[PDB]
Design a protein around this ligand. Sequence first.
Ligand SMILES: COC(=O)[C@@H]1CC2=CC(=O)CC[C@]2(C)[C@@]23O[C@@H]2C[C@@]2(C)[C@@H](CC[C@@]24CCC(=O)O4)[C@H]13
Length: 244
Amino acid sequence: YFSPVMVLENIEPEIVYAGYDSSKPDTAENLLSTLNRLAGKQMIQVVKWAKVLPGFKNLPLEDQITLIQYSWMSLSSFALSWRSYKHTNSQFLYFAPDLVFNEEKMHQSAMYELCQGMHQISLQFVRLQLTFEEYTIMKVLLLLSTIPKDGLKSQAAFEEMRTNYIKELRKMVTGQSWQRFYQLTKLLDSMHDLVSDLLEFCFYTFRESHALKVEFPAMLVEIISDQLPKVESGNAKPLYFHRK
Ligand SMILES: COC(=O)[C@@H]1CC2=CC(=O)CC[C@]2(C)[C@@]23O[C@@H]2C[C@@]2(C)[C@@H](CC[C@@]24CCC(=O)O4)[C@H]13
């Protein structure tokens, strides 16, 4: 099918600034609009990364779009946990160098509980001493973790790619290694529940954005308008390593 982990380490997207205006009041609307703007900028980086991801090009365009749209909150939250771990030892939420959340910002954002939920994942990175090589493979697995309930256009092509990256994770964890592999698959599975709550809040603010004064960039409007009716109608199928 394929040293893909070496390629993953090298294609990691660069630093994305939030463009946070600290001279503006820290209302929920101002913080959430900055977070949405940062998400749009990161989503362009996700598309550029995916294009050069080994095996991703073999999937038809429709499937590439489906995977990117279904997984955007997963990839985004996992990278946030990584940045938080690497740059603050998971003491804060490192959204961007110019936007680091402390307790004050967690409360002001009107997402305190969702923020604490995120902080728990970054705290697991500390507990496990997650490595950069493990992180990069796991991020690919999150891109491939949610599919249509009736499957993709080229389901066989997708399963081959996913299976091959799971094999890369197993080779990477290796004096006993099975223990580590299951610790990593348990972490990946726990992302689906967190992502459900994050999407619930995102969908809510999207449905009445002006009413709440929350701004969405064009990129997020497009993704969310497509994703929201699919997720809410049960057309999304989260893939679990270990059925709950
Ligand atoms: C703790 O929340 C988050 O951090 C997640 C993950 C994430 C990490 C990043 O590093 C980029 C930003 C995103 C995508 C995100 O902050 C934006 C704003 C999102 C889309 C939010 C879930 C709900 C919200 C709030 C307001 C809205 O409309 O939806 C995301």
